[PDB]
Structures are given as C-alpha cells and as structure tokens.
Write a protein that binds this ligand. Structure first.
Ligand SMILES: CCCCCCCCCCCCCCCCCCCC(=O)O[C@H](COC(=O)CCCCCCCCCCCCCC)COP(=O)(O)OCCN
Ligand SMILES: CCCCCCCCCCCCCCCCCCCC(=O)O[C@H](COC(=O)CCCCCCCCCCCCCC)COP(=O)(O)OCCN
Ligand SMILES: CCCCCCCCCCCCCCCCCCCC(=O)O[C@H](COC(=O)CCCCCCCCCCCCCC)COP(=O)(O)OCCN
Ligand SMILES: CCCCCCCCCCCCCCCCCCCC(=O)O[C@H](COC(=O)CCCCCCCCCCCCCC)COP(=O)(O)OCCN
Ligand SMILES: CCCCCCCCCCCCCCCCCCCC(=O)O[C@H](COC(=O)CCCCCCCCCCCCCC)COP(=O)(O)OCCN
Ligand SMILES: CCCCCCCCCCCCCCCCCCCC(=O)O[C@H](COC(=O)CCCCCCCCCCCCCC)COP(=O)(O)OCCN
Ligand SMILES: CC(C)CCC[C@@H](C)[C@H]1CC[C@H]2[C@@H]3CC=C4C[C@@H](OC(=O)CCC(=O)O)CC[C@]4(C)[C@H]3CC[C@]12C
Ligand SMILES: CC(C)CCC[C@@H](C)[C@H]1CC[C@H]2[C@@H]3CC=C4C[C@@H](OC(=O)CCC(=O)O)CC[C@]4(C)[C@H]3CC[C@]12C
Ligand SMILES: CC(C)CCC[C@@H](C)[C@H]1CC[C@H]2[C@@H]3CC=C4C[C@@H](OC(=O)CCC(=O)O)CC[C@]4(C)[C@H]3CC[C@]12C
Ligand SMILES: CC(C)CCC[C@@H](C)[C@H]1CC[C@H]2[C@@H]3CC=C4C[C@@H](OC(=O)CCC(=O)O)CC[C@]4(C)[C@H]3CC[C@]12C
Ligand SMILES: CC(C)CCC[C@@H](C)[C@H]1CC[C@H]2[C@@H]3CC=C4C[C@@H](OC(=O)CCC(=O)O)CC[C@]4(C)[C@H]3CC[C@]12C
Ligand SMILES: CC(C)CCC[C@@H](C)[C@H]1CC[C@H]2[C@@H]3CC=C4C[C@@H](OC(=O)CCC(=O)O)CC[C@]4(C)[C@H]3CC[C@]12C
Ligand SMILES: CC(C)CCC[C@@H](C)[C@H]1CC[C@H]2[C@@H]3CC=C4C[C@@H](OC(=O)CCC(=O)O)CC[C@]4(C)[C@H]3CC[C@]12C
Ligand SMILES: CCCCCCCCCCCCCC
Ligand SMILES: CCCCCCCCCCCCCC
Ligand SMILES: CCCCCCCCCCCCCC
Ligand SMILES: CCCCCCCCCCCCCC
Ligand SMILES: CCCCCCCCCCCCCC
Ligand SMILES: CCCCCCCCCCCCCC
Lengths: 202, 202, 202, 202, 202, 202
C-alpha cells in the first residue's frame, strides 16, 4: 500500500510555491478550523435566548434582535472560509485530470503555461475574497461589541434598551480572527510577488 | 492496494462529459452539502419556540405557525438535493453491472448506444426536478420573509399579529441557495447542448 | 487488497434476480434510510412539548396525548424497515456458510435446489410484512392528521379540545412513505412472477 | 490483505455449534442492539420532566418518581445485554491465546477436551442470566404500565395521584423485548441438548 | 497486510503475566468503559436541574447543592479509570522504544532485568491508586444516597430541607462500581504474589 | 502495508531528544486532551443558566456575569493547548519536506545545523507560551473561586450579590491543570539544558 500517486500529485500541485508557503499556509488552515469548531461555536449558542429587553410590548425583542444582528459572526466566518478554499480544490481537480490525460497520451502514442496562469488567478481570487469580507465586516459591525443596545423599531414605543450576552469574550475572538485573516492575506501576497519576480527576471 | 478498478469505473462513467463539467459540477455538490449542514441548519433550530403571537387564546399560535410554514425550507432543500442526485447513482450502478457482465463474457467465450441514451435521460431529469422545485418554492413562499404575519384562522378572534425569528438571515441564505440552483441548471443544460451538437455534426 | 471474495458472494447471492431488481431495490433502501434519518426525525422532536389542551385539570394533557398517539410514526417506520430487511441478511449468512463448506469439501476430498426455495420464502415474507404494516397503519391512524383533537378520557371533565404540532408537514411525509412502500411492494412481486414463470416454462 | 487468520479463528470458535445457531443467534444480537439504540432510547427521554403529580407540597414529585421507578427499563436492558455477551468474549480470547501457543509449540519443537467444557459452561451461564433477569423484571415491575399511580410516601399528605408519560408505547416495547429474550433462551437451550446428545450417543 | 509486529509487541509486553491475567483483566476494562459510557452517564444528567429546596431565599439552592456534592461521582470515576491505566501505556511505550533500539543494534553491529522492575512498579502503583480512590470515596460520601438533605449554610435561614433526584438507582450503580474495583484490586495482587514466588523459588 | 516511512520520519524528528522525553511528554498530551474533553467540559455547561443575582432590575445579571467571567476557563485552556502544540507540527512539516528534497537529490545526481536551531527555537517558544498563559491566568482570576460575588456595575442599584454554580469542583480542576502545566514546563526545560550541555562539552 505505497502512496506514491499522492506524492506525485502533491509535487505537481506545489511546483511553483516557495518553501515557507508549504508550511505556514497549511498549518494556518488547521488552526482556523480547530479554533472555529471548538471554542467560538459554543459561546454563540445562547445568543437569542439570553437576549433581553426592558418592555412589556410583545414582539419588540424579536425585531430588535433582528435589527442588531442581521447575520451571526460564526456563519459569516464559515462563509468566509468556504469561499477562500474552493479555488485550490478546483486547481487540484484540474491538475488531477491533466495528469491522467497525459499518462493516457504517453501510453497510447508510444505503443511555463496554462497551469501557472491558473495558479496566479487562484491566488488573486483568494486575496480578493479576504479583502471583500474584511471590508463588509468593518462596514456592518466593526470589531467590538457593547453591552447595551438602543432600539427604535416598531412596535417598540419611542425607544427600548436591550442587553446582550457575553459581550467581552466575543470581542477577543473577533480580534483573534482578524489577526489570522491579516496573516493569511500577507502570506498570499508574498507568493504573488515571488512568482512575478521569478517570471520577470528570467 | 492499487485503486485501478475505481479509475476504470470513473473513466467509463465520464466518457461523454466535457472537461469543465468534471470539475465545477463535482465541487458544487460538496459546496452545497457543506453549506446546508454547517450554517443554515442551526439558524432554523428555534423556528417554533421563538415564534410569538399577541393573544390569550390557547391554540392560536399552533394553527398560525402551521398556516405560515406548511413545510420548512431546510427539509425542502434536503428533498431537492436528494431528488437531483439519484439518477447519477442509478447510472453508476448500471455501468458497474454492465462492466462486470462484459468482463465475464470476455473471459468465458475466449477460453454510441444505450448508455448515451441513459446519460441524456438522467441529465434531462435533473434539470426537470430543479425547475419543478424552483417553481413550487416561488408559488408557495417567494424569496423573502417578513417580520410580521397576519393570521385569520380559527380559533383566533377576528385576526392576530405574529412575529417571526431571524427574518433577515434566512433571506440571505435563501438567495444563496437560489443562485446555486441556477448555476447548476445552467451547467447541466450546457452538457445537453454539447452532446447533441456532437451527435448531430458527426 | 483485491476484493474478489466479495464479488463471488455478491454474484452467488444475486444469481436468480433480474437485471432491474439489482438497481432500483438497492437504491430505494438508501433513499429510505436517508429520508428517515435526515428530514422526518427532526419534525417529530417537539411532538409532546408543543402539544396543548384547553383546561386547568392536572393530568388531562398526558392521558389525551397517550390516547391520540399510542405509538409515534417514526418508530413505527423504524420497526417496518427493520422487519423487512432481516430475511436478506439471513439468506446472505446462509450463502456465506454454504460457500465456505463447499470450498472445504472441494479441497479436502480432492487431495435449482434449496437456495431457490429460501429465496422465494424470503421474497414472500418481505411482501407479507409490508402489507401487514400498511393495513395496521390504515386501521389505527389513516393517512392524514387534523389540527384539533377531541378528548373524552378521565379525569378530563366531559370533553377537552387539544391542539397538535405541525399537522401539515407530517401528512406530506406520510404520503411520501406510503408511495415508497407501494413501489417496494410492486418491485418485490415482479421478482416472484419472473421466477415462477422461468421455473414453469423450463 | 487476505483475512485468513480471522477465518481460522471463526472456524475454531464455532466448531461444536449447529448450522442454524451460526445464523439466527448472530442476527438476533444485531436486531437487539439496533432496536435498543434507535427506537426505545428516545421514548424514555422525557420520563421525569413530563411526570406530574397533583399537589402543592414541594418534594412529593421527586420521592414519588423514585418510588415508582427504582431503575429505568433501558438501563436494565443494557445491563441484561452486557451480562449475556461477556462469556463469548472470554471464550474467544481463550481460543485466541491457545491457538497462538499451539502455533509457537509447533514451530519450536519441529525445527474433545477443555474447550468443550468451557463452551458448555458459557452456554449454561447465558441462559442462567437470561432467566434471572426475566424473574427480577417480573417481580419488580411486571409487563405493563398504568397511566395513574398512587403515592403514599412522606412528605406527601395522606396520598397523591401522579401521571406518567407515554404509558402505551412502553408496553409495546416491553412485550417486544420479552419475546426476543424468550427466543434467545430457546435457541440457547437447543444447543445444549444437541451437544449432550452428540456426546452421549458417541 | 500481516500484523506481525503487533504480535511481537504483545508477546514482549505480556511475557511475565499469567494465563488468566491476560483475559479477565482485559475484559474488565471493556466492561468498565461500556458501563460508564452507556448507562450511568445518563442518570446523572439532571442532577442539578431536578434538585429542589423548600425556601424562598434566592441563592440557597446553589450553595446547598455545592455543599452536598463537592464533586460528581461520574467525574470521580473518570479520574479513577484514567489514573489506573497510564502506567501500562508508559510501560508499552518503553518496550516499543527498547525493541526498536535492539533491532537497530542487531542490524548495525552485525554488518530478568529492568523490564521486570518496571512491571512490578506499575502493578504496585495501580493497586495504590485503587486503594487511595476507594478510601477517599468512603471518607467523603460513603456508598449510599438519601432522598432528603439538611442544609445549614448561609444565606439559608436556620436550616433548609432539600430533595435529590434518583437516589435509588445511583446507589445500585455505586455498588456495581465498588464490586468491579475490588475484583480488579484482587486480580492485580495475585500477579504480584505469583511474580515474587517465581523470582524467589528460582 | 509496512509503515517504514513513518518510522524514518519519527526517528529523524526525535534525533536530539532524550530517552525519557520520548515517553512522558507524549503521554501527558493524551492525558491532557482526555481530561479536557471528558470531565471538565461538562461541569461548565450550566455556567450562565444557573447564575443567579438578587434583584428585580432587568439587565443586571447579564452585565454582572460578563464582569465576573470575561472569558471561560475551558476556552482559555483550549487556546493554551493549541498555542503550545503548533511549533512541533511546523517542525514536523519542515523535516518531511527536507527529507523528500534530500531523497530527490540523492536519486537525481547519482544516476549539527539548521534543524538543531529550529528544535531549540520550538522548545523555547513552548515554554514561553506556558509561562505567559500562567501569568495571565494568575493576574485575571487566580486559582480559586468563591460562591458569592459582589457587583457594582450599572444599571444595578448601588450593589448586588450574585451566586455561582459549582464553585468547589472547578477549583479542583483548576489545581489539576496547574500541576499538569508545571510538569510540562519542567520537562521542557530539562531538554534545553541537556541539549546545551551536549553542544558545549563536545
Ligand atoms: C505520511 C508520512 C509518509 C512519508 C512518505 O514518505 O510518504 C510519501 C507520500 O507522502 C504523502 O503521504 C502525501 C501526503 C498526502 C497524505 C495526507 C492526507 C491524509 C491526512 C491529512 C491530514 C493532515 C492535514 C511517499 O511518497 P514518495 O516517496 O513515493 O514520493 C513520490 C515519488 N513519486
Ligand atoms: C487519490 C489520488 C490518487 C491518484 C491516482 O493516480 O489514483 C488513480 C485512481 O484514481 C482514483 O482514486 C479514482 C477516484 C475515486 C476515489 C475518491 C473517493 C473517495 C473520496 C472522495 C471524496 C472527494 C469527493 C490511479 O488510477 P489509474 O492510474 O490506475 O487509472 C486507471 C487505469 N485503468
Ligand atoms: C467499488 C468499485 C470496484 C470495482 C470492481 O471491479 O471491484 C469488484 C468487486 O466488487 C465489489 O466491490 C463488491 C461490492 C461490495 C462493496 C460494497 C460495500 C461497501 C460500501 C457499500 C455502500 C453502498 C451501498 C472486483 O471484483 P472481481 O472483478 O474480482 O469479480 C469477482 C470475480 N471472482
Ligand atoms: C466478508 C466476505 C469475505 C468472504 C471470504 O471468503 O472471506 C473469508 C474470511 O471470512 C471472514 O471475513 C471472517 C469474518 C470476520 C469479519 C467480520 C467482522 C467485521 C464486520 C462485522 C459486522 C457484521 C456483524 C476468507 O477466509 P478463508 O477463505 O481464507 O478461510 C480460512 C481458511 N484458513
Ligand atoms: C485479530 C485476529 C487475528 C489472529 C492472528 O493470528 O493475528 C496475529 C496478530 O495478533 C494481533 O492482532 C495482536 C492484537 C492487536 C490487535 C487488537 C487491536 C485492535 C482492536 C482492539 C479491540 C479489542 C480490545 C498474527 O500474529 P503472528 O501469528 O504473526 O504472531 C507474531 C509472531 N511474530
Ligand atoms: C504500532 C506497532 C508497530 C511496531 C513496529 O515495529 O512498527 C514500526 C513503525 O512504527 C510506527 O508505527 C511509527 C508510529 C506512528 C504510528 C502512530 C500513529 C497512529 C496512532 C497514534 C495514537 C497514539 C498517540 C516499524 O517500523 P520499522 O521497523 O521499519 O523502522 C523504520 C526503519 N526504517
Ligand atoms: C469534505 C471533503 C471530502 C472535502 C473538503 C476538504 C478540502 C476542501 C480540503 C482538502 C485539503 C485542503 C487544503 C489544504 C491546505 C491548504 C493551505 C492553503 O493552500 C496553500 O497555500 C498550500 C501551500 C501551497 O501549495 O503553496 C490554503 C487552504 C488549503 C488549499 C486547503 C483548502 C481545503 C482543502 C482543499
Ligand atoms: C450513503 C452513501 C453510501 C451513498 C450516498 C453518496 C452518493 C449518492 C454520492 C457518491 C458520489 C456522488 C456524486 C459525486 C458528484 C456529482 C456531481 C454531479 O455529477 C456530475 O455531473 C459529475 C461530472 C460528470 O460526470 O460529468 C452531480 C452530483 C454527483 C453525481 C454526486 C451525486 C451523489 C453521489 C453519487
Ligand atoms: C450494523 C451493520 C453491521 C449491519 C446492518 C446492515 C445490513 C442489514 C445491510 C447490509 C446490506 C443491506 C442490503 C442492501 C440492499 C438491499 C436491497 C433489497 O434487496 C434486494 O432486492 C437487492 C437486489 C437483489 O439481490 O435482487 C432489500 C434490502 C437490502 C437487502 C439491504 C438490507 C440491509 C442490508 C443487508
Ligand atoms: C467495543 C468492542 C471493541 C468490543 C465489543 C464487541 C464484542 C463484545 C462483540 C464482537 C462480536 C460479538 C458476538 C457476535 C455474535 C454473537 C451471537 C451469539 O453467539 C452465538 O451463539 C454465535 C453462534 C455460535 O457460535 O454458535 C451471542 C452474542 C455474540 C457472541 C456476540 C457477543 C458480542 C461480541 C463478542
Ligand atoms: C496492545 C498493543 C500491543 C498494541 C496497540 C498499541 C500501539 C498501537 C501503541 C504502543 C506504543 C505506541 C507509540 C508510543 C509513542 C508514540 C507517541 C508519539 O510520538 C511522536 O511521534 C511524538 C511526535 C514528535 O515526534 O514530535 C506518536 C505515537 C507513538 C509512536 C505511539 C503509537 C501507538 C503505539 C505504537
Ligand atoms: C486515545 C487512544 C489513542 C489511546 C487511549 C487507549 C489506551 C490508553 C489503551 C489501549 C489498550 C489499553 C489497555 C488494554 C487492557 C488492559 C487490561 C489491564 O492490563 C492488563 O493487566 C493486561 C493483561 C496483562 O498484560 O497481564 C489494565 C488496563 C489495560 C492495560 C488497558 C489500559 C488502556 C490502554 C493502554
Ligand atoms: C486534526 C489532525 C489532522 C491534526 C491535529 C493533530 C496534531 C497537531 C498532533 C499529531 C501528533 C501530536 C504530537 C504528539 C506528541 C507530542 C508530545 C510533545 O512533544 C514531544 O516532546 C515529543 C517527544 C520528543 O520528540 O522529544 C508535545 C506535543 C506533541 C508534539 C503533540 C502535538 C500535537 C500533534 C502534532
Ligand atoms: C503570528 C505570526 C506568524 C508569522 C508568519 C511567518 C512569518 C515569517 C515568514 C514565513 C516565511 C519564512 C521564509
Ligand atoms: C459563481 C460563478 C460560477 C461560474 C461557473 C463557471 C463559469 C465558466 C464556465 C465553466 C466551463 C469553462 C470551460
Ligand atoms: C417513482 C417511480 C419509480 C419507478 C420504478 C421503476 C419502474 C420501471 C421498472 C424497473 C425495471 C426496468 C426493467
Ligand atoms: C420469531 C420467530 C423466530 C424463529 C426462530 C427460528 C425457528 C426455527 C429454528 C431455527 C433452526 C432451524 C434448523
Ligand atoms: C464476578 C466474578 C469474577 C471472577 C473473576 C475470575 C475468578 C477466577 C480466577 C481467574 C483466574 C483463573 C485461573
Ligand atoms: C506527576 C509526576 C510526574 C513525574 C514526571 C517524571 C519524573 C521523572 C523524570 C522523567 C525522566 C526519567 C529519566
């Protein structure tokens, strides 16, 4: 049970990458998924059951929660990490099929090119998605949470004060994820610069 | 432990497919199942416990919820994704048995045809199911949710106002799924056009 | 790691079956288990917590629920699908042991029969169980659910109105399962007719 | 990856068994564990939360529940199925070690007996445990449940009426398990009779 | 895929053990983990939600529960079973590394001792931990539970009566675990006596 | 299926380590993860639902809980154990790639150094993280919990007394984790001293 075809595929996929990029970028993905699945996912469990508002009006809590949180952070991060990893899978499948076709051609008729361009495009799109998600998060929420929220949506009469759950831990986790995203963006830009320098000097 | 029979089966199954269809259509299924299982399934958890109506009448909440939501979106999508994937499994089993029979025939007696038609039929049925589900969803619900619902079902007296849970996130997820379905439909139609052009020109 | 003994066992088990029966009957089992485990099992979760009755008498809700639902549909279906699949497992084990004994005999002493009857018996019993379960379900419940139930069991005084949870989705799922069961019954009867015709003409 | 040592161990373990016992007794274990893990385990979930008594005295519900149910049925059945399966595992380990020692002896010094007795003892103990558990269950509970219970334990004043959850489904499952246990006992006694007849006639 | 190195490691690890100890001690661990994970873990679920005290003072329930149960039984048993199994893992790793080093030495330079002492030390420490845990449990709790508890901790005024959940089942499980622990201790002492007798007579 | 490349990688990774460090440090990680995942994670489940304060003011409980527990202990420990294990994974990947490159070089052109420095750096960083986390925990919380907390945050009027859940078990687990961390730190420092002594004397 020798896993040599996996080695061939891995070597072909990582032909144009640097030595460092083969390590940090791979470990960061594992770090990200572990942190997302273990710690943060449980702090957001009681985000609506422990949300309280000061009023007797039936229906103000629902509308005020929907106004405060149009989309939860955890699902935003899940979307972010899904959109960032699909280009690599597409490239891997492309390489797999190309290798199979080349092997068939070699066995049948013996009885720098497109791949670099695809690699560059994938690396560009990953950074584009990172920047877009960061900008959207900055515009909608920010990078902090306050304990008291003021609601002025009907049928609440003239105003309402509402109180959040765990507004301090979530800030810490938000900052952690921001740092991780910035590190990933920098590591992805370095690869583009290296590739273009190699392609220009020679 | 060489997995060569899997390669033979894969090559036989994807004989008439294009180069692109071998990649995007496969990755889209993984994207779909991951998104369905991770993010959306948790937003619909408190769909009946956090549903509130303004009245003292016992029994109005149950009937009004049943009137508003005859069937949840998540289970509708589960049915949609199950009905779209069975034709491929049937075709795969058919090819498996045909290959086994051909091998037996070759070993025993040496001591464009039906498969294309089945492929075309499967591709047609997948698109048919996609369109049918989209039309049903458009007729029953639409592609948005409102925060306030008006109920006029007995025993509620003369009318009742009821309030939903997370009416903004669900709209976002609905739009995402709509886009995914449209992309899948287009990618399936392209294959039919390509196959018919190849079969007509030659 | 060649899986050839599995192939021998599979060919021996499916010797008397038709070409179609090797595909539809196998896929239907997967469809059934997936649908049972994913969608329906979650709709029946709040079947007793969201069941409400109009009264102040302590104890009427419990007795009225027990009177309305002597046994839940999901567990009835689990029993149905367990009782329908055991004959095949028994036949498979029988074939396995017979093959081992035949191999031992061949190696030791060289230093249409019972199996058809067992196959017929198993196919008969599967249909018998299907019909029995369908008849019991028809007699006890029917194939629909109503939103309001009338209870006349002690200690409830003179009568009580009670209200169910999700009475419309469950009807849809009931109809789905009924259709699946009918399809399975028809596909099983076809095999008996084919076998008897082959055994009579030759 | 040929699994021949597993075959040798299986043949050695089942040397003195009948043809039928190799099939029904093995399938019954799978049936038992599936039924225990899928259906019954969920019906007993709300056994204490939905238990209600008619009184204002704080503490009567706890003591009356503890008096009605000294031990739940599901855990009783788990103990029953654990105590019935350990002798076979002990015998299997004994055979494994004996085979290893015999192989070592054969390679080193070539440079009806105890096993039957152990088999008989294990078969006897399995039936003994079955009978003991059945008798205990008959003495403590019976084979049915009633909807209303009468409690006369302090601090409840002079008497209390309490009401159970799902008293009709549980009776059905109890009867099912009783039938399964009786079938297992009969199948185990048959093996003893067969073994003793073979050992006496020859 | 022959698993011969596993056999070598197993034979080396169990060189000084008796015939019986290779069976009962191994099966007892499986029995213990199964019983701990299946039955008992669910009876302790509602240990604080169903705990009730007779008073209106806010805060007496929390302090009285903390006074009654400084540590739950299930977690005590988890610690007990973890502390008893680590010496064997350490010894196994030691043997693994020693065997690798010996193989390297044999291939390089051909181009009763410490292990017994380690075995004895491990066997001693297992019994020491068993006895220590039993003594601590006897001192803190005992081997039974009563339904009514009397609390005299502030801010409760002058006294309070509190009521437990399932005080009869837990006694049964406690007795079961006590018996298992005693059996394990005896089986471990037998090995020490056998080893010392063999080492003294010869 | 011989796992010899795993052996080569393991021997290369642990070339500069002592004999003891190959055992205790590996077993301690398993001990840590088992203890974290089995016992402690369930004691912190009802940390906010069972937290109670004496007042009628809506919103004081949320703010007072957020003030008492800026971050839960379990998630702090998860972060601690994640930050301590990434350097080893980075070093392992580095060694893997270096070995592959060396093999390629050997096959192509035949048709104490950096690794020690990386090992030292990783060992230093692990201890640095341990010390930093211990200091932060000491500064923020301490190593004990009290049953009564005094809150002076708005909108609570002038003061509030609040009561915690399970304040005695958590102290025990905190002490356990502290001891484990200290042991790990000592075992890591020993390796640095040994390495430097070997590098200086020779
Ligand atoms: C694993 C350690 C094995 C070391 C090893 O030499 O295996 C190589 C395969 O690498 C590989 O194993 C390729 C890596 C793919 C396996 C990883 C996926 C499973 C688990 C991933 C979890 C971590 C994230 C052999 O290959 P070779 O020497 O023959 O060189 C190809 C020349 N044609
Ligand atoms: C995996 C990477 C292995 C690369 C490789 O060359 O394996 C081929 C098999 O492909 C295959 O492995 C076929 C793909 C089936 C495996 C995928 C299913 C398991 C996981 C799926 C999750 C992703 C969705 C060898 O085949 P060959 O060179 O001998 O060519 C057949 C000529 N007769
Ligand atoms: C799998 C695809 C492998 C294709 C293949 O040729 O494998 C055959 C075995 O079939 C088989 O693999 C038998 C099917 C049993 C495997 C399926 C059970 C695992 C997963 C089931 C989930 C789906 C429901 C080889 O057999 P051969 O050419 O040597 O012919 C026996 C002549 N003596
Ligand atoms: C599986 C189907 C394989 C059929 C087969 O011939 O395999 C035999 C092994 O049987 C076996 O495979 C022994 C049965 C043990 C495997 C079952 C345990 C895993 C799953 C259990 C779930 C069901 C309960 C070969 O053996 P052979 O022809 O070489 O005869 C031993 C002569 N020395
Ligand atoms: C399994 C049944 C296989 C029987 C068998 O003969 O396998 C032996 C290996 O034993 C073994 O398999 C060693 C036992 C380790 C496997 C058990 C761990 C996995 C599951 C554990 C769950 C139960 C607790 C062969 O070994 P050999 O004849 O070559 O003798 C070593 C001479 N150098
Ligand atoms: C396992 C017991 C097998 C014993 C054995 O000799 O296997 C060695 C491999 O070690 C190994 O197996 C390396 C250890 C990696 C496997 C452990 C990862 C899976 C489970 C981990 C859970 C415990 C934490 C053979 O190697 P060799 O004699 O050929 O020497 C390399 C010379 N070039
Ligand atoms: C549900 C299962 C069947 C499919 C889901 C898993 C895949 C989507 C995984 C398998 C390997 C993963 C990759 C492993 C590591 C990397 C690190 C990083 O890529 C790199 O830069 C690697 C270094 C390099 O090649 O230069 C970005 C994420 C990525 C591609 C991962 C993206 C997600 C991948 C493709
Ligand atoms: C529970 C387990 C035992 C069975 C359930 C899994 C199957 C139903 C999976 C295995 C592979 C899956 C397929 C993998 C990828 C594709 C992509 C797509 O098909 C294609 O067009 C592939 C590209 C081509 O062949 O042209 C539509 C879904 C489909 C068939 C998937 C449908 C679901 C399949 C058959
Ligand atoms: C927990 C694990 C170890 C055992 C539980 C799984 C088995 C009970 C499964 C394995 C394969 C399954 C079978 C696979 C497919 C078929 C389709 C169908 O049988 C057929 O008619 C197959 C076609 C034919 O042979 O003619 C009825 C169910 C059955 C026998 C399934 C019944 C359940 C089986 C035996
Ligand atoms: C957690 C894992 C690692 C161990 C737990 C599983 C075992 C305890 C299983 C493996 C195979 C099982 C056995 C498979 C089938 C049989 C049927 C039956 O035994 C027979 O009579 C078999 C027929 C015969 O040999 O005559 C009684 C239960 C028993 C021994 C089972 C008892 C439980 C066993 C030993
Ligand atoms: C019942 C027995 C006879 C067989 C079943 C147990 C084995 C599978 C155990 C015994 C010794 C274990 C090994 C002992 C020590 C280590 C710890 C660990 O060592 C490392 O590689 C540390 C990582 C690093 O090098 O930095 C990796 C797993 C490994 C090889 C263990 C793998 C599993 C082993 C082989
Ligand atoms: C999470 C995974 C990767 C590691 C956790 C599992 C181990 C800690 C297991 C593997 C085998 C187990 C052992 C299997 C059986 C025995 C029986 C018993 O030891 C004996 O006396 C065996 C008989 C003998 O050798 O004399 C005490 C527990 C012990 C060592 C077990 C302790 C726990 C062990 C080492
Ligand atoms: C989700 C899966 C795919 C990846 C997550 C698991 C890894 C991060 C594991 C695999 C082996 C583990 C290691 C096994 C044992 C050790 C013991 C210890 O390292 C040692 O000192 C080993 C002894 C030595 O080499 O001197 C510190 C933790 C470490 C490196 C572990 C850190 C976590 C590791 C790398
Ligand atoms: C958090 C800090 C992570 C640092 C990322 C690595 C920085 C060094 C650059 C890696 C490439 C080395 C050649
Ligand atoms: C979201 C956009 C997805 C685009 C789908 C692919 C469009 C290009 C066509 C694929 C075939 C390339 C030859
Ligand atoms: C839902 C409809 C399912 C149809 C079942 C198959 C009908 C055709 C008969 C199969 C055998 C083809 C020879
Ligand atoms: C439920 C009924 C189960 C019947 C058990 C088998 C009865 C026949 C005896 C089996 C041995 C056949 C030789
Ligand atoms: C519960 C009783 C368990 C008994 C343990 C075995 C007693 C016999 C001694 C085993 C060694 C046999 C030589
Ligand atoms: C808890 C105590 C753990 C002790 C750790 C081991 C102490 C001995 C040093 C190990 C190296 C032996 C050479």
């Amino acid at each position: 049970g020798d896993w040599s075809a996996l080695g061939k595929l891995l070597d072909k996929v990582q032909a144009y990458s640097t030595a460092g990029g083969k390590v940090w970028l791979s470990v960061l993905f594992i770090f990200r998924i572990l942190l997302l699945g273990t710690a943060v996912e449980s702090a957001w469990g009681d985000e609506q059951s422990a949300f309280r508002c000061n009023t007797q009006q039936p229906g103000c809590e629902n509308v005020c929660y929907d106004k405060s949180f149009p989309i939860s952070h955890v699902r935003f991060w899940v979307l972010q990490i899904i959109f960032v990893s699909v280009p690599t899978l597409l490239y891997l499948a492309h390489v797999f099929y190309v290798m199979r076709k080349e092997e068939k051609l070699n066995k049948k008729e013996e009885e720098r090119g497109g791949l670099l361009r695809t690699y560059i495009i994938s690396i560009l799109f990953k950074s584009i998605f990172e920047v877009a998600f960061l900008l959207i998060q900055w515009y909608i929420y920010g990078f902090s949470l306050s304990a008291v929220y003021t609601c002025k949506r009907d049928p609440c009469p003239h105003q309402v004060d509402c109180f959040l759950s765990r507004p301090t831990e979530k800030t810490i986790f938000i900052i952690f994820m921001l740092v991780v995203s910035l590190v990933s963006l920098a590591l992805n830009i370095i690869e583009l610069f290296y590739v273009f320098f190699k392609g220009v000097k020679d």
